[PDB]
Design an enzyme around this catalytic site. Structure first.
Site, short mmCIF file in Angstrom:
data_model
loop_
_atom_site.label_atom_id
_atom_site.label_comp_id
_atom_site.label_asym_id
_atom_site.label_seq_id
_atom_site.Cartn_x
_atom_site.Cartn_y
_atom_site.Cartn_z
CD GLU A 234 1.65 -10.99 -0.20
OE1 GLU A 234 1.26 -11.85 -0.79
OE2 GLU A 234 2.35 -9.94 -0.28
CG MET B 269 -1.81 1.12 1.23
SD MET B 269 -2.29 2.05 2.60
CE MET B 269 -3.57 0.60 3.17
CG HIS C 213 -5.96 9.48 1.44
ND1 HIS C 213 -7.09 9.68 1.19
CD2 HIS C 213 -5.23 10.58 1.43
CE1 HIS C 213 -7.27 11.22 0.88
NE2 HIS C 213 -6.01 11.57 1.00
CD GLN D 21 3.15 9.55 3.65
OE1 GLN D 21 3.91 9.94 4.53
NE2 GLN D 21 3.56 8.55 2.69
N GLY D 22 -1.45 11.69 6.03
CA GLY D 22 -2.05 12.25 7.21
C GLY D 22 -3.33 12.87 7.19
CD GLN D 23 -4.70 14.59 2.43
OE1 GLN D 23 -5.05 14.00 1.67
NE2 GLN D 23 -3.96 16.00 2.40
C1 LIG Z 1 2.49 11.08 8.43
C2 LIG Z 1 2.58 9.50 7.74
O1 LIG Z 1 1.24 9.35 6.93
C3 LIG Z 1 0.95 8.22 6.50
C4 LIG Z 1 1.86 7.01 6.23
C5 LIG Z 1 1.35 6.04 5.73
C6 LIG Z 1 2.64 4.98 5.24
C7 LIG Z 1 3.42 5.35 4.11
C8 LIG Z 1 3.12 4.56 2.74
O2 LIG Z 1 2.74 4.94 1.67
N1 LIG Z 1 2.54 3.27 3.07
C9 LIG Z 1 2.14 2.90 4.09
C10 LIG Z 1 2.25 3.47 5.19
C11 LIG Z 1 1.74 3.04 6.41
O3 LIG Z 1 1.94 3.49 7.63
C12 LIG Z 1 1.39 1.67 6.53
C13 LIG Z 1 0.76 0.90 5.03
C14 LIG Z 1 0.35 -0.37 5.28
C15 LIG Z 1 -0.91 -0.63 4.99
C16 LIG Z 1 -1.52 -1.63 4.70
C17 LIG Z 1 -0.78 -2.81 4.67
F1 LIG Z 1 -1.43 -4.04 4.49
C18 LIG Z 1 0.69 -2.69 5.06
C19 LIG Z 1 0.94 -1.44 5.34
C20 LIG Z 1 1.78 1.39 4.25
C21 LIG Z 1 0.13 5.95 5.31
C22 LIG Z 1 -0.81 6.73 5.51
N2 LIG Z 1 -2.27 6.81 5.17
O4 LIG Z 1 -3.15 7.33 5.58
O5 LIG Z 1 -2.37 5.56 4.66
C23 LIG Z 1 -0.44 7.98 6.04
O6 LIG Z 1 -0.98 8.99 6.27
#
Ligand SMILES: CCOc1cc([C@@H]2CC(=O)NC3=C2C(=O)C[C@H](c2ccc(F)cc2)C3)cc([N+](=O)[O-])c1O
Length: 314
Positions: A251, A216, A227, A223-225
């Protein structure tokens, strides 16, 4: 000779470009968290003074500009093949100057998301009041243009996921879930790429599947919204409609995945009958795993985690 060492994390300028002005606006630039797969643990490149690697993407379609710039290079000493290394991980057909890139910007009005719309949501602005509008789509390689788009998109895995590696897109068990933001430009509604998730539809003997989240990626500016929370909720709700799906898992259950998972499963489960104040206090019951599986394809073991959290809340 050591004066020609440049850290590549800070040398690789990424941009998502919606308007021409974005080219000149340093706030729109973001940078790799990782470049070790091209440049080693040291994340350095030898041979250049003032190395600048430009990977500009048009916000929706991800049509790419790729340029290497430098003050000087060493060229019997041989600079690292920066160009060659980047070309390994991006498709051909990129343009190489800002003029050609801006040309592509005019045609972006016609860029449309791939696949099936599953969900639309709003996120409140930091300033407050304004809502941004987002959409999650489910796509696959039968959708015209998606394969090329996925090649443009997946490069980002290299910059932002440490152990990242490209998937075999010819395997039909891959499912793709895309996030887009809708934005206005001169009266038209355009789409900007925000992120995506790949989900592998593992076969389970004999007539069932067990989707597993593989990657993902939410791109840095978004980020930080919330999503990821929307994306995972949407995926759970999507696969619920298939009786032939057992459950949904990851996984690679990182700390951040577990945090995200616990958030979403609590959101999905708190209003269920089987997880009511009165039913929680009687103890954990198999009934809870049954209902969680039926309603949202929640893994048996995950339902035990939800139970603890909800029972603490009471
Ligand atoms: C201030 C930081 O803000 C966000 C950071 C992320 C990170 C970065 C990124 O691009 N990938 C992912 C993130 C994760 O923390 C975990 C995720 C993950 C989900 C499912 C799965 F099965 C395995 C891993 C991988 C997501 C978000 N977000 O909102 O989604 C941030 O806001």
């Amino acid at each position: 000779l050591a004066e020609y060492k440049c850290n590549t994390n800070t040398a690789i300028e990424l941009k998502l470009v919606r308007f021409p002005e974005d080219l000149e606006n340093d706030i729109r630039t973001f940078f790799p968290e990782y470049t070790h797969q091209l440049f080693g643990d040291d994340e350095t490149a030898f041979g250049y003074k003032g190395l600048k690697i430009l990977l500009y993407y048009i916000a929706g379609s991800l049509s790419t500009m790729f340029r290497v710039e430098y003050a000087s290079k060493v060229d019997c000493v041989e600079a690292d093949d920066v160009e060659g290394k980047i070309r390994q991980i991006i498709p051909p057909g990129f343009c190489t100057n800002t003029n050609d890139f801006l040309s592509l910007l005019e045609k972006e009005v016609d860029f449309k998301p791939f696949g099936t719309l599953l969900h639309t949501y709003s996120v409140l602005s930091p300033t407050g009041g304004e809502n941004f509008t987002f959409q999650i789509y489910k796509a696959d390689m039968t959708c015209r243009g998606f394969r090329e788009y996925h090649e443009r998109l997946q490069t980002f895995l290299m910059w932002f996921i440490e152990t990242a590696s490209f998937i075999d897109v010819d395997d039909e068990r891959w499912h793709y879930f895309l996030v887009f933001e809708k934005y206005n430009k001169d009266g038209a509604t355009l789409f900007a790429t925000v992120g995506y998730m790949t989900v592998y539809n593992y076969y389970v003997y004999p007539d069932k599947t067990r989707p597993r989240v593989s990657q993902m990626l939410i791109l840095t500016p978004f980020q930080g919204q919330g999503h990821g929370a929307q994306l995972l909720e949407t995926v759970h709700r999507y696969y619920t409609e298939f009786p032939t799906v057992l459950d949904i898992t990851a996984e690679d259950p990182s700390k951040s995945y577990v945090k995200l998972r616990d958030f979403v499963l609590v959101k999905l489960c708190q209003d269920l009958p089987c997880f009511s104040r009165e039913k929680l206090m009687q103890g954990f019951n198999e009934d809870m795993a049954i209902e969680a599986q039926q309603k949202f394809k929640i893994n048996k073991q995950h339902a035990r985690r939800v139970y603890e959290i909800l029972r603490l809340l009471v």
